[PDB]
């Protein structure tokens, strides 16, 4: 249960764009600042910038 401090605009299929307050299911956050998150709204995978999300 993470919260995207802001809306992240992805630029490739290896990442998903989120909005501010959007909840994302973090997956792997030990690889790089870009953790893999999965949206539960539609069900799609997409890395995410950690500087744009925070642990509630």
């Amino acid at each position: 249960t993470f919260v995207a401090l802001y809306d992240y605009e992805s630029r490739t299929e290896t990442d998903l764009s989120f909005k501010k307050g959007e909840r994302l299911q973090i997956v792997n956050n030990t690889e790089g600042d870009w953790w893999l998150a999965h949206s539960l709204t539609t069900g799609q995978t997409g890395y995410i910038p950690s500087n744009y999300v925070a642990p509630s």
Binding site: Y6, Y8, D15, D33, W34, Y52
Partner: peptide, 12 residues
């Protein structure tokens, strides 16, 4: 374990 290493974007 490869697309997680990227240059974080500019925060708002």
């Amino acid at each position: 374990v490869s697309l997680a290493r990227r240059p974080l974007p500019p925060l708002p």
